[PDB]
């Protein structure tokens, strides 16, 4: 059974929800949405592990496009939890009636271009087939081979498939992984579990998030100033709601530096620490080191036991998405929390009763939690039968690193777009999702008005875009993995407006 539509939107997180709203309400296109999830919410649908929390502040982790909605939504704390965000995204879907454009619990399994007809032939896992003029892919994004893993008699849980309402209260838990998800899950588990063992491979740099109850209504004061808030964020590099400093770290005294660091520490927020204090933490070695040493002193001060402190001490460049936490380091002071540094004491095997390390101790567990991420990020592209012009498979097109033109498109796949594809901005992401979806929507409307049959980037333009992302990246310390565009949102937005205004420079446009 075969349906013919104007647009397919794959995914129902922030990106897919807005794409469907744009393509249907603005453009008047027959548009169908899909998601494996049973509901909208995307990453916030799947991720229900304890202590799930935004690193963007509450008032800015949301859409900006609707003024009334912005005046309507509420929240409890300065930062927003998974249940609050998910119910927000459910409210967005209800607000604009997008529910009836979505097929939930429905996986897209093939998207094939039809060269002679100029259409995409897209099929689900219930064998329905959609013939579409445009595809918008807002698809978003790992089990450590551990010997004897399935010998384990307790529960094994990955962070990304946390069984609904499962509590670990009163259990013996092991946590493997100390990324953003690891730290949250660890801070949240420490108070409730009978015992907790963390297996840390790379300890990370992390600052206080400063997640505070919000004042009766000084939600009101932000709501009264929302147009300015969003205009500023749109006109900044990372759109996290503070002035991004230009002040070189090493051009003030030791005591001013410490003072400025301390005030960011106490206010909290990860990007604020990296980009709100000074302007060169990411591009100058001594500045980076200075921010690095500050955090390490914090760690040395907070963790009382010298040996525990040592295992948790972050080292090297403070040059990965700045982490922020709700008392992560302090957790290691509790008598039922234990850290194992697996670089120096590797995991030997898992057995019925728990994890055995190379020192030959059995860490008896009831539950093993993997906060170990997913294998790949481009996997929602690589796992689908996606074929563009001349039957060229996406995996063969991206025979190396995945590429894009402008973060939203790629050679050989006409009328096929990406929300947060490779080589795109690195930012508080909803305002970048909006930028991309707005532009993709503008583009699709343009094609409709102008009897365009196919639009796709040139290999030159795409390759020039990669060179552009690689130049900007090489100026930063984040080099020394995937290539973001690191010019910031303002720059990115100008790049996008310019391309559209200059009549889609870099794109081949068949009519």
Ligand X SMILES: NC(=O)c1ccc[n+]([C@@H]2O[C@H](COP(=O)([O-])OP(=O)(O)OC[C@H]3O[C@@H](n4cnc5c(N)ncnc54)[C@H](OP(=O)(O)O)[C@@H]3O)[C@@H](O)[C@H]2O)c1
Q: Which residues are annotated as a binding site for FAD?
A: 15, 35, 43-44, 46, 55-56, 61, 108, 321, 429
What 3-state class would DSSP assign to 302?
helix
Q: Does residue 187 touch ligand FAD according to CB under 6 A?
A: no
**Residues touching ligand FAD, count (CB under 6 A):** 32
Q: What is the DSSP letter of 223?
A: H
Q: Applying CB under 6 A, which of residues 5, 7, 9, 12 lies at the interface with ligand FAD?
A: 12
Task: Please identify, using beta-carbon distances, which residue of 98 and 207 lies nearer to ligand X.
Answer: 207
Q: Is 486 in the site for ligand FAD (CB under 6 A)?
A: no
CB 342, min distance to ligand X, A: 6
User: Binding ligand X by CB under 6 A: which of 16, 33, 182, 407?
Assistant: 182
Nearer to ligand X (CB atom), residue 106 or residue 423: 423
The residue written with tokens 């219930």 in the block is 126
The one among 141, 224, 250, 475 contacting ligand X by CB under 6 A: 141
**Torsion angle of C-alpha atoms 467, 472, 475, 479, degrees rounded to 10:** -70
Burial track 218-234 (b if 16+ CB lie within 10 A, e otherwise): ebeebbeeeeebbeebb
Using CB under 6 A as the criterion, what x/- string covers residues 465-484 for binding ligand X? Answer: -----------------x--
Q: Of 300, 367, 294, 365, give the one whose Cα is nearest residue 332.
A: 300
Stretch that binds ligand X, among 255-263, 365-373, 447-455, 500-508 (CB under 6 A): 365-373
Q: In the set 8, 16, 203, 434, which binds ligand FAD (CB under 6 A)?
A: 16
Decide: is 436 part of the binding site for ligand X (CB under 6 A).
Answer: no
Choose among ligand X, ligand FAD, none what residue 12 binds, the Cβ cut-off being 5 to 8 Å by kind. Answer: ligand FAD
Q: Does 440 bind ligand FAD (CB under 6 A)?
A: no
Instruction: Work out which of 9, 11, 48, 325 binds ligand FAD, going by CB under 6 A.
Output: 11
Q: Which is nearer to ligand X, 248 or 373 (CB)?
A: 373
Query: No. of H helices and E strands in the chain?
Result: 16, 22
The secondary structure of 444-480, three-state, reads: HHHHHHCCCCEEEECHHHHHHHHHHHHHHHHCCCCCC
238 binds ligand X (CB under 6 A): no
Residue 61 binds ligand FAD, judged by CB under 6 A: yes
Both tokens assigned to 234: 């749109």
Q: Closest distance between ligand X and the C-beta of residue 178, in Å? A: 4
User: Residue 364 CA to chain centroid, in angstroms?
Assistant: 34
245 CB-near residues (< 8 Å, 6+ apart): 275, 276, 277, 278, 279
H-only helix segments in 276-320:
285-302, 306-312
Among 54, 78, 106, 159, binds ligand X (CB under 6 A): 159
Whether 456 contacts 412, CB under 8 Å: yes
Residue pair 455/508 in contact (Cβ under 8 Å)? The answer is yes
Interaction of residue 36 with ligand FAD, rule CB under 6 A: yes
- Binding track over 136-175 against ligand FAD, x by CB under 6 A: --xxx-----------------------------------
| Among ligand FAD, ligand X, none, residue 366 binds (CB under 5-8 Å by kind) | none
Burial class (CB in 10 A: 0-12, 13-18, 19+), 163: exposed
Per-residue binder mask for ligand FAD (CB under 6 A), 363-392, x = binder = -----------------x---x--------
Nearer to ligand FAD, 184 or 415 (CB): 184
178 binds ligand X (CB under 6 A): yes
3-state secondary structure 177-207: CCCHHHHHHHHHHCCCCCEEEEEECCCCCEE
> Which residues make Cβ contacts (< 8 Å) with residue 429, sequence separation at least 6?
14, 56, 420
Residue 14 interacts with ligand FAD (CB under 6 A): yes or no: yes
Binding site for ligand X (CB under 6 A): 141, 144, 159, 176-182, 201-202, 321, 371-373, 377, 482
């Amino acid at each position: 059974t075969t349906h013919t539509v104007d647009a397919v939107v794959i995914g129902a997180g922030f990106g897919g929800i807005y794409a469907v709203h744009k393509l249907h309400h603005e453009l008047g296109l027959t548009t169908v949405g899909f998601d494996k999830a049973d509901g909208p919410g995307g990453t916030w649908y799947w991720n229900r592990y304890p202590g799930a929390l935004s690193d963007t502040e509450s008032h800015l982790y949301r859409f900006s496009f609707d003024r009334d909605l912005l005046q309507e939504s509420t929240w409890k704390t300065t930062y927003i939890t998974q249940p609050e965000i998910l119910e927000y995204l459910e409210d967005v879907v209800d607000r604009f009636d997008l529910r009836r454009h979505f097929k939930f619990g429905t996986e897209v399994t093939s998207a094939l271009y039809l060269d002679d007809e100029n259409l995409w032939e897209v099929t689900t896992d219930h064998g329905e087939v959609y013939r579409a003029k445009y595809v918008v892919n807002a698809v978003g994004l790992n089990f450590p081979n551990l010997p004897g893993l399935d010998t384990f008699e307790g529960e094994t849980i990955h962070t990304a498939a946390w069984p609904e309402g499962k509590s670990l209260a009163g259990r013996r838990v092991g946590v493997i992984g100390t990324g953003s998800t690891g730290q949250q899950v660890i801070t949240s588990l420490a108070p409730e579990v009978e015992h907790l063992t963390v297996f840390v491979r790379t300890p990370q740099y992390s600052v206080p998030v400063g997640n505070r109850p919000v004042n009766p209504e000084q939600i009101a004061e932000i709501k009264a100033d929302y147009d300015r808030i969003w205009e500023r964020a749109k006109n900044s590099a990372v759109a996290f709601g503070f002035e991004e400093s230009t002040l070189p770290a090493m051009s003030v005294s030791e005591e001013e530096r410490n003072r400025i660091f301390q005030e960011a520490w106490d206010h909290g927020g990860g990007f604020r620490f990296m980009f709100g204090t000074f302007g060169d933490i990411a591009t100058d070695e001594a500045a980076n080191e200075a921010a690095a040493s500050f955090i390490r002193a914090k760690v040395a001060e907070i963790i009382e036991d010298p040996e525990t402190a040592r295992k948790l001490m972050p080292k090297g460049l403070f040059a990965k998405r700045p982490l922020c936490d709700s008392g992560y380091y302090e957790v290691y002071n509790r008598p039922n929390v234990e850290a194992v540094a697996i670089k120096e004491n590797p995991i030997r095997e898992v057995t019925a009763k728990g994890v055995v390390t190379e020192d030959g101790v059995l860490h008896e567990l009831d539950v093993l939690v993997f906060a170990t991420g997913f294998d790949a990020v481009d996997g929602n592209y690589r796992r689908i039968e996606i074929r563009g012009r001349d039957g060229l498979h996406i995996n063969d097109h991206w025979d190396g690193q995945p590429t894009s033109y402008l973060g939203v498109s790629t050679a050989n796949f006409p009328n096929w777009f990406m929300v947060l594809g490779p080589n795109g901005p690195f930012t508080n992401l909803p305002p970048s999702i909006e930028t991309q979806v707005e532009w993709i929507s503008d583009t699709i409307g343009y094609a409709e008005r102008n009897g365009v049959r196919a639009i796709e980037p040139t290999p030159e333009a795409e390759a020039e875009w990669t060179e552009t992302c690689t130049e900007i990246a090489n100026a930063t310390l984040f080099t020394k993995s995937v290539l973001f565009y690191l010019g910031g949102l303002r720059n990115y937005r100008a790049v996008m407006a310019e391309v559209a205004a200059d009549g889609y420079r870099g794109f081949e446009v068949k009519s």
